[PDB]
């Protein structure tokens, strides 16, 4: 049905809306974690 | 904005203003604030922190008491 198709399309839109709120937060979290690993690697190089 | 006064038998440690306290109470860590409710509690050998506009100093109180009003 047309209404069902709109709901299915809207489900993807909600996922994208959720991604916009949370995915950038996760990316920043990974960058902080990766930077910490890089900082440890930098410490090894400096040591 | 509460008058914190860390005192000791040998001398007084500090008497400055404070925004937050991280009190290591015996049965569980408790926070103190500008207009805190009345409390009076024993401390244990542990770690006490105070926040100065977002700066943490580890006083590391080894035991004692505290009275909150």
């Amino acid at each position: 049905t047309l209404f069902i198709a709109q709901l299915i399309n809207f489900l993807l839109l909600i996922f994208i809306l959720r991604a916009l709120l949370y995915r950038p937060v996760m990316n920043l979290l990974n960058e902080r974690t990766r930077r910490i690993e890089e900082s440890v690697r930098d410490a090894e190089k400096v040591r | 904005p509460i008058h914190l006064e860390i005192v000791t038998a040998e001398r007084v440690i500090l008497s400055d203003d404070v925004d937050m306290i991280s009190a290591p109470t015996k049965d569980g860590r408790v926070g103190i604030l500008p207009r805190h409710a009345p409390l009076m509690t024993i401390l244990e050998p542990g770690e006490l922190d105070i926040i100065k506009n977002g700066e943490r100093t580890p006083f590391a109180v080894s035991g004692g008491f505290m009275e909150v009003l």
Partner: protein, 222 residues
């Protein structure tokens, strides 16, 4: 109009021509392999995203297992890793990922039972391997007066993997039923983020299953 149906099949019997559960498992495996290919060949010293998944999932789970049980997390690392990176992925693929059991000309009981059988085989192999007679300990021994239910405790442990399989099939199937109900009445999930709640519930269920496997292993340790 509600049209939900049970996808119960026999793992022992040959796969059916439709094989909805098998198809979902194949799709989840393909997606996981695609992610692994994207993160392996295009891997750098400090990758972002590609290595972020590894660092925040595999390393985090290894650290958690070591904290819970160090030197035994290493031994059963493959079991917990297999529980992870799966089931949750199958549910994400089954969370109305463009199909929603529509346009056809974990929830499977057999798969959950097989997973619990693998968990119980992990018990029979590793748990009490350091003792051998550990399974007989505190079970009708000389102190059986205070340990009469010890054999009952073992039966519960035997029933613990079965309950884990039930919890894998349950909730996951529930999410499907709730999505079908929302489609039948009040579509597009619901006023609340039904889809998001279902996804979070599936992820939490997968994490809880992995933690339950690790905790059962630790309990078998002592």
């Amino acid at each position: 109009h509600v049209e939900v149906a049970a996808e119960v099949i026999f793992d022992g019997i040959p796969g059916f021509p439709i094989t909805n559960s098998f198809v979902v498992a194949i799709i989840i495996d393909i997606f996981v392999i695609a992610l692994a290919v994207a993160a392996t060949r295009n891997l750098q010293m400090v990758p972002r995203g590609l290595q972020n998944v590894m660092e925040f999932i595999l390393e985090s789970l290894y650290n958690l297992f070591r904290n819970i049980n160090a030197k035994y997390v290493a031994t059963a690392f493959p079991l917990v890793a297999t529980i992870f990176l799966f089931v949750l992925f199958g549910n994400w693929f089954g969370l109305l990922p463009g199909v929603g059991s529509i346009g056809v000309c974990a929830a499977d009981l057999n798969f959950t039972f097989a997973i619990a059988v693998i968990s119980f085989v992990f018990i029979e192999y590793w748990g009490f391997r350091a003792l051998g007679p550990g399974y007989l300990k505190k079970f009708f021994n000389t102190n059986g007066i205070m340990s009469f239910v010890g054999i009952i405790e073992f039966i519960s442990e035997l029933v613990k993997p079965f309950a884990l399989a039930f919890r894998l099939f349950g909730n996951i199937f529930a999410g499907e039923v709730l999505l079908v109900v929302m489609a039948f009445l009040v579509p597009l999930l619901l006023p609340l983020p039904f889809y998001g709640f279902e996804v979070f519930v599936g992820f939490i269920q997968a994490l809880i299953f992995a933690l339950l496997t690790y905790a059962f292993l630790n309990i078998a340790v002592t």
